[PDB]
Design a protein around this nucleic acid. Structure first.
Lengths: 204, 81, 158, 103
RNA sequence: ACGGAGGGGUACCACCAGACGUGGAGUCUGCGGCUCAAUCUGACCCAACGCGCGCACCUCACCAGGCCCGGACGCGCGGAGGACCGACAGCCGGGCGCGCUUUCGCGAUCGCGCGGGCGGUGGUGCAUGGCCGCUCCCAGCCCGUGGCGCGAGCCGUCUGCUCCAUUGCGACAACGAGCGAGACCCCGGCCGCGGGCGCCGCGGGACGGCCCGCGCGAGCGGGAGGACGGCGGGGCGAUAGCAGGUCUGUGAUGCCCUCAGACGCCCUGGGCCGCACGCGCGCUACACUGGCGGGGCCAGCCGGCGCCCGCGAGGACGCGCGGAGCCCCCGCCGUGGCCGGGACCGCGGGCUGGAACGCCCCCGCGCACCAGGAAUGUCUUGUAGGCGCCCGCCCCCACCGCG
């Protein structure tokens, strides 16, 4: 009735582009950290890909008339062998920075490498999140200093709701004595106006 | 599931005390329908709605046969003397 | 080879169209991965299976099982109905049971009267209830801990 | 003019892939675009040991990635290449929801 | 924390009642020991031993031998009156302008030293991150105010009744919240709508709801009607902790060791398979509830076929088309280690690959094995058991693992 090796191109064409992206995420994390990159995407255009990004400091990523962004633009082209010009990156901005784990973890990492100790940085971060409308955070720092945790309020850590409400991130810090494993988790029960189960109300 | 968690019981008690004139016990259709109303109460999930409604009917018939403490029925008129 | 849920089997497009319409009633029966489709038209009386006479279906020993819906009742009504069953699925026995279920359901519908239908329902269900209502249980999965659904690989504590 | 063109939608997420078709059929309200064939799901599967060193009770991750796809070959030559572009613009811009048009 | 102390509970990783097995043989594989030049290493009760995803070369660290610098960047000296680099021919060399013997070619891409690198399946998992395993197939863990004690601490957080469950009812110097449990997500059984190349998208339905017994109480027993009746199968997984495993998964890494006769990278061979022996997960059998021949026939994760040679395995062509064992029927064999059993071995015909030590088919020979001791493992419905079929790593190969 149908042949199974025709649709295989379409199926395999979509899978390749997925991997084509993760490499972008890795590269941005290794490069555009200065602007606190958060996440990316893709949109296969007629003759290119309309990759858009999210970075808290949009100004840092782009340069004079986006000059350094243009610089990056050609680079990717050769790596993926796509025609330049057709490439058309886009730049976005994040509003509630105290609601994203990755920007906070990166700022916290930088701060830690500023000679300031774990306690002040962790409490600064949790204060920043809570003042940004979050039910709670949790900072864990592990390395040659064991594990010294810090926590403020209520978090969930089990169930399906975790993957959508709770957002976690991790990093590694190369310090002279060794490595300082640091991670962060934030639980926002109001994301995108989604109703957490077993949360009820009754009226008059 | 036979033992009902605390949330079910507390919300069901609230519903009965609040909407009593329109919850006829011993049926699982009327009470479910009424609990479906958002002016009455809101249930995010189907199974939770059915569970709450069932506990509400059992509480309501237990009360109609013999009212309980903790649920206000405004029965003073027949006990105000 | 056939899945059982193919559009072709369900709609019995194998039959030629001018003969497709003459069949009115439609019926269904299943057991485990087996789907049997039956079309009925009133007639001198006869049955078929996968293009085979009902008698010469080869579990042989289970002929009475495929014919129970008939000898349970009288041949009076079965005389006026003709069927062209088409079955496809897993296992000979499963096909057999699905076929008898489809026969029962199809004959039940064609009565066209509700009270006599209820009376036949009472008669038939008294005998094996799984002649009208389907059987639910189905094969389950297997977990990596063992090499079976519930059995586990032998463990050596020493 | 007439090209016997085809429309194919490929994606992973059931939510968008089902919402996007609704907009497409809206846009094809008058050009005769009709129901889409929904292909069987291509559930890709992979298994892997959870332990990088293979210690302890042998456990296994089970990740899978589905590939929903729909086809609106209805247009065929019923529409002109002039508005085939119009077909491709009024539609919403979903970040990942690959599509391709062939005759 | 422990108790060969008491009282309540609980679980086929416990028992009752049963079922199917292992330990007895042959064999696949891994683990110790012996051997060699090497037979590379990690792990050793639960919680090491078909596990670190299929070892002819690479994989690969190990053994016998051999190419190359592929020494960044700075400073000092030298250099086109010539820094460094290749080569026909003859010998020694497994071979290479590898080495030597004559003499042509190339031209600053640098040469020597000092500072300073990169690299490395090299070491410490008892320096660490990350990820898993176990405690844990558990039901437990804590906060603000308040009170009791000099204090470490106690109450909150239950010597009552229920739940598989700190799940609930009802009390009390406690009051009020939170995490885990539940809810939650995937799959399947019934029904409806819509659409439809290919059966695939959105919703209803079951809730201890009805009847009868009890119990204040939550909740237990029985009966119905219904596709399904009382945690249907999976995913997620609390606090705190371990000197559990992993530096041999990585541009994850501190400190050590190696760095121009190299532990760098590469090439030719060999080895990881070697065997007096001990055992761990498995496979084949010891037969009549059977073996052989002919025939009929139905699955799902899903899926590619025609013609012609050849006994068969296989082979040359050309195009898009397509599914099995058990089982049932007819006959032979007739209790004999026999027509049960197919290990081992000898000619031969083919496939992969640069290269067979790898894998298939044919003729011939026809080992132990007569139901397996002390001991021991798993299991409650589409379940055990029996029967076969696809994927994984893969040039060839599945007794393995996921399904």
């Amino acid at each position: 009735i149908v042949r199974r090796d025709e649709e295989n191109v379409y199926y395999s064409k979509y899978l390749n582009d997925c991997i084509m992206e993760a490499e972008l995420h890795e590269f941005f994390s290794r490069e555009l950290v200065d602007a606190g990159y958060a996440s990316c995407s893709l949109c296969r255009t007629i003759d290119s890909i309309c990759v858009i990004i999210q970075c808290a400091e949009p100004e840092v990523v782009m340069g004079d008339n986006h000059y350094r962004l243009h610089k990056i633009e050609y680079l990717l082209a050769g790596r993926f062998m796509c025609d330049p010009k057709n490439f058309n990156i886009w730049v976005d901005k994040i509003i509630k920075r105290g609601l994203s784990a990755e920007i906070m973890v990166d700022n916290l990492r930088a701060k830690l490498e500023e000679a300031m100790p774990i306690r002040r940085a962790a409490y600064s971060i949790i204060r920043t999140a809570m003042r940004a409308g979050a039910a709670g955070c949790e900072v864990i720092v592990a390395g040659k200093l064991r594990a010294n945790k810090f926590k403020e309020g209520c978090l969930i850590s089990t169930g399906h709701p975790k993957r959508i409400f709770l957002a976690e991130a991790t990093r590694h810090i190369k310090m002279r004595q060794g490595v300082i494993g640091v991670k962060v988790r934030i639980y926002n029960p109001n994301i995108r106006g989604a109703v957490m189960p077993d949360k009820i109300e009754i009226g008059a | 599931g036979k033992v009902r968690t605390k949330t079910i019981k507390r919300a069901a008690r609230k519903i009965v005390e609040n909407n009593y004139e329109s919850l006829k016990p011993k049926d699982f259709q009327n009470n479910k329908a009424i609990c479906s109303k958002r002016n009455v109460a809101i249930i995010p999930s189907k199974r939770l709605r059915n569970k709450v409604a069932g506990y509400v009917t059992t509480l309501m018939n237990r009360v109609v046969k013999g009212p309980v403490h903790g649920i206000s029925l405004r029965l003073q008129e027949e006990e105000r003397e | 080879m056939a899945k059982g849920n193919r559009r072709d089997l369900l709609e019995r497009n194998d039959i030629e169209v001018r003969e497709r319409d003459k069949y009115t009633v439609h019926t269904l029966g299943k057991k485990k991965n087996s789907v049997a489709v039956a079309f009925v038209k009133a007639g001198k009386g006869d049955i078929l299976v996968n293009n085979v006479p009902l008698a010469l279906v080869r579990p042989e020993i289970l002929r009475t099982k495929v014919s129970e819906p008939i000898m349970i009742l009288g041949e009076s009504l079965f005389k006026g109905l003709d069927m062209n069953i088409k079955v496809a699925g897993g296992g000979h026995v499963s096909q057999i049971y699905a076929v008898r279920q489809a026969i029962s359901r199809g004959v039940l519908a064609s009565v066209k009267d509700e009270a006599a239908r209820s009376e036949l329902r009472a008669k038939l269900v008294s005998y094996d209830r799984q002649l009208v209502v389907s059987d639910p249980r189905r094969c389950e999965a297997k977990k990596f801990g063992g090499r079976g659904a519930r059995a586990r690989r032998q463990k050596s504590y020493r | 003019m007439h090209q016997k063109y085809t429309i194919i939608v490929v994606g992973k997420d059931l939510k968008l892939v089902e919402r996007y078709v609704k907009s497409i059929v809206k846009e094809g309200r008058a050009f005769g675009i009709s129901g889409p064939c929904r292909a069987p799901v291509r559930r890709l599967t992979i298994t892997t040991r959870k332990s990088p060193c293979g210690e302890g009770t042998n456990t296994w991750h089970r990740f899978e990635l589905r590939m929903y796809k729909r086809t609106f070959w209805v247009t065929c030559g019923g529409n002109d290449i002039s508005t085939i572009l119009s077909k491709t613009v009024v539609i919403p811009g979903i970040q990942v929801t690959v599509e391709v048009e062939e005759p």
